[PDB]
Structure formats: C-alpha cells, structure tokens
C-alpha cells in the first residue's frame, strides 16, 4: 500500500465543459462550473483553486496558480451514457454500451399505458416528486379511486406508491415486478424501480418498512468487489450504496444533504479502515441542476469548498483525497437532464510535499478505479489506467 486510506469524493453533475462527443447527447454549448462562475460573476473556491482547480480550466473566479497541492487533469467518460449509474459505474472499473434513462420529468405516455393494460389499474402522477410531497398531493386521490401513485426523483428511479389498505402489500410487489420487467428495455431504462407502501389517512400519510427495491447491480465486477473481497474497507456514503446496489459495500453511510455528507466523511476520516471511503455530494444534481438553479448551485459550490479546510485537517500523509465528478448538469444548458461534459479530477495527499502537476487528460473514469486498485493490490478492472505512479 502507498496509501492506506483514499477518499473518493464525486461532485454529482459538476462538470468542466463539453465532451468531445457532446453533439451526441444534445449537449452542444453544455459548461457546467464555467456557466455557473459566469451567472455568479466569479466562483469562490479558494481550496479547490489551491488544488489546482483553476490549473485544469481557467474560469470566472477561479485563476491557476503557481504551486498547487495536487495533482490535477479532466477525465473523459467512456460509456454511452451520461446518467449517475453509468458514471459511477465507469469510475469504478466498467464500460457501459447500454445506459440508463434518467427521466428528469416523469415517463413517456406508452410506458405508463403498458403498466396499466398489465395491471388492472390507472395511474395518477408521473412528475418528478419527494415522497412526502406527492402523498400530500395525490394519497387521498390514489385511496379513493385505487390509482397507482407513480413518481420520480431527480434520478433514474421509477416509484410507485400506493396505500397498504386499498392496494395489498403482494399486489404492489406484483406491480414492481411487471414495472421492473418493461423497464428493463434499453428505451426505457431504469436502474431501480420502488414500491413505495403507505399508510394512514388523509393529511397525515407515513412510508412503510414494506418498501422493496428492484434494482440493477452493475454490469460486472467493480473495483468496488475486489477490494470488498480480499477484506479491504469499502465505506458508502450518501446514494452510493443505491447506485451499486450494495456491491463491494462493506459500510453503508446514507446522509441528507451535501453537507451532512462532509460530516460523515470527516468521521471516516476519524475512523481506522485499511480501503476506500466513498461519497457522494448529491445536492448539486438534485437540488440544483435539475431545477436549473445556477445561483443555488453557485452557493453549494462555495458552500462545499469552505468545507474542504476540515478535510485538510485530517488527512494524514498516508491517506489520499480524490476528487471528481460523475457527469455535467448544466443549469444554463436548455432542460433538465444531465449533459456530457468532461469531470475534473485533483488528486491530493499532504505526502505530496513539493505539490502536484498536471496529469494526463484521463480517457476513461475507470482511471480512477485502477488506481484504486493498483493502490490495494487487488484484480485491476478491464478498463481503466492507473496514475498511482504519478503520484
Ligand atoms: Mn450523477
Ligand atoms: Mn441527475
């Protein structure tokens, strides 16, 4: 081991600029962190610019500077998709000819007809929604006439919600079964499909334990199961544990905001683990980019930057931090998917004493997996090159 402990930190939908192939996705014109910096005249992010931020693209605020702390470049993704599961994904060792759909808005028409011709039942919704807002909105409408609740996040989840004492327990199963079956088709792609139980009565409803979940687990073995299986640590922060459907976890860590997430990082940071602590900054994408909110996004920007002094403070020189993104989600760009942008990646570690350089511009985000693994010793993933040695 070089190092014994790497925090891996992904910035959801924090991209640095349109891909290459960027015409592809629709994503023509698509930047990010440069748009947000340009609506915010001028980002504020003195410790992500003193890792070298500003030394990968030069933008409004954000200037190079002369010594950075880490190591630094621009990753290039791969896999065919630009949704959270497939970046995660590729980060983590794999490549993704079929990806999923994100469904920023809700699901098409056909699908949805399909559901109810296989079930017996209409279905109210489909709008992107939290699981609260949506049973004050439509819980006494689906009681009354028997309707599916169908919802989404942000997210390429599919959710159904439905009362326990006018839909049974096994007939919602039933439901997440068949829902899970047609959406398990390339134009229709879902990574998890959720029975969402609920009880109660009218203005005052409660989810149940009885919730299942029909997820996808990733499309082979991650880096993530290597190290899991040779007794390494593999610490879940955030949706992590969703997005990989528990592969390779060997501790689950589930957080409410962005900066909940920076405090269970600080406390893996107080913990003794021989592995990976993984987390994922989620805010950007939910709150912000889906709801095109370049001012917000601005300000959590700022916000988790100002939280990056107290992860300075703990690292040991042994321990290295990663930090990257897993696609864009412009809040400029024309509506309200994700788009196809390069993510930046700074790599620091206080034993980089004379600090960083610019690294090569990573083909893949499986470059960072490979160095993960190179790092522990354990299977090095098919796709991927390492950079430990640049280090
Ligand atoms: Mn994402
Ligand atoms: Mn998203």
Same mark, same amino acid.
């Given at each position: 081991?070089?190092?014994?402990?790497?925090?891996?930190?992904?910035m959801?939908?924090?991209? *640095?600029?349109?891909?290459?192939?960027? &015409?592809?996705?629709?994503?023509?014109?698509?930047?990010?962190?440069?748009?947000?910096?340009?609506?915010?005249?001028?980002?504020?992010?003195?410790?992500?610019?003193?890792?070298?931020?500003?030394?990968?693209?030069?933008?409004?605020?954000?200037?190079?500077?002369?010594?950075?702390?880490?190591?630094?470049?621009?990753?290039?993704?791969?896999?065919?998709?630009?949704?959270?599961?497939?970046?995660?994904?590729?980060i983590?060792?794999?490549?993704?000819?079929?990806?999923?759909?994100?469904?920023?808005?809700?699901?098409?028409?056909?699908?949805?007809?399909?559901?109810?011709?296989?079930?017996?039942?209409?279905?109210?919704?489909?709008?992107?929604?939290?699981?609260?807002?949506?049973?004050?909105?439509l819980?006494?409408?689906?009681?009354?006439?028997?309707?599916?609740?169908?919802?989404?996040?942000?997210?390429?989840?599919?959710?159904?919600?439905?009362? &326990?004492?006018?839909?049974?327990? $096994?007939?919602?199963?039933?439901?997440?079964?068949?829902?899970?079956?047609?959406?398990?088709?390339?134009?229709?792609?879902?990574?998890?499909?959720?029975?969402?139980?609920?009880?109660?009565?009218?203005?005052?409803?409660?989810?149940?334990?009885?919730?299942?979940?029909?997820?996808?687990?990733?499309?082979?073995?991650?880096?993530?199961?290597?190290?899991?299986?040779?007794?390494?640590?593999? *610490?879940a922060?955030?949706? *992590?544990?969703?997005?990989?459907?528990?592969?390779?976890?060997?501790?689950?860590?589930?957080?409410?905001?962005?900066?909940?997430?920076?405090?269970?990082?600080?406390?893996?940071?107080?913990?003794?683990?021989?592995?990976?602590?993984?987390?994922?900054?989620?805010?950007?994408?939910?709150?912000?980019?889906?709801r095109?909110?370049?001012?917000?996004?601005? &300000?959590?920007?700022?916000?988790?930057?100002?939280?990056?002094?107290?992860?300075?403070?703990?690292?040991?020189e042994?321990?290295?931090?990663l930090?990257?993104?897993?696609?864009?989600?412009?809040?400029?760009?024309?509506?309200? $998917?994700?788009?196809?942008?390069?993510?930046?990646?700074?790599?620091?570690?206080?034993?980089?004493?004379?600090?960083?350089?610019?690294?090569?511009?990573?083909?893949?985000?499986?470059?960072?997996?490979?160095?993960?693994?190179?790092?522990?010793?354990?299977?090095?993933? &098919?796709?991927?090159?390492?950079?430990?040695?640049?280090?």
């Amino acid at each position: 081991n070089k190092y014994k402990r790497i925090f891996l930190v992904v910035m959801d939908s924090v991209g *640095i600029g349109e891909a290459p192939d960027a &015409e592809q996705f629709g994503d023509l014109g698509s930047d990010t962190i440069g748009h947000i910096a340009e609506h915010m005249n001028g980002l504020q992010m003195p410790n992500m610019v003193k890792l070298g931020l500003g030394n990968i693209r030069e933008m409004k605020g954000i200037s190079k500077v002369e010594k950075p702390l880490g190591y630094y470049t621009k990753m290039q993704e791969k896999s065919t998709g630009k949704d959270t599961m497939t970046g995660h994904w590729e980060i983590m060792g794999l490549y993704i000819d079929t990806p999923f759909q994100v469904f920023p808005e809700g699901f098409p028409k056909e699908l949805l007809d399909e559901l109810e011709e296989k079930t017996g039942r209409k279905i109210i919704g489909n709008k992107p929604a939290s699981g609260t807002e949506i049973l004050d909105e439509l819980g006494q409408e689906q009681m009354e006439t028997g309707s599916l609740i169908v919802y989404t996040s942000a997210d390429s989840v599919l959710q159904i919600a439905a009362h &326990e004492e006018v839909v049974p327990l $096994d007939e919602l199963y039933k439901i997440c079964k068949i829902a899970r079956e047609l959406t398990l088709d390339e134009k229709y792609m879902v990574g998890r499909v959720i029975a969402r139980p609920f009880v109660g009565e009218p203005g005052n409803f409660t989810r149940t334990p009885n919730r299942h979940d029909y997820a996808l687990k990733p499309f082979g073995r991650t880096v993530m199961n290597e190290l899991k299986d040779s007794d390494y640590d593999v *610490i879940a922060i955030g949706k *992590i544990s969703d997005i990989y459907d528990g592969e390779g976890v060997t501790e689950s860590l589930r957080t409410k905001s962005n900066m909940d997430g920076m405090d269970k990082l600080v406390d893996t940071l107080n913990m003794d683990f021989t592995g990976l602590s993984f987390l994922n900054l989620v805010d950007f994408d939910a709150l912000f980019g889906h709801r095109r909110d370049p001012q917000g996004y601005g &300000e959590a920007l700022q916000e988790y930057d100002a939280r990056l002094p107290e992860v300075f403070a703990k690292l040991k020189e042994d321990d290295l931090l990663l930090i990257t993104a897993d696609h864009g989600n412009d809040p400029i760009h024309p509506g309200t $998917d994700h788009t196809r942008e390069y993510v930046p990646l700074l790599a620091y570690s206080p034993s980089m004493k004379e600090g960083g350089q610019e690294l090569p511009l990573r083909q893949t985000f499986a470059d960072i997996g490979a160095t993960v693994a190179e790092n522990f010793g354990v299977k090095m993933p &098919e796709y991927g090159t390492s950079f430990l040695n640049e280090l």
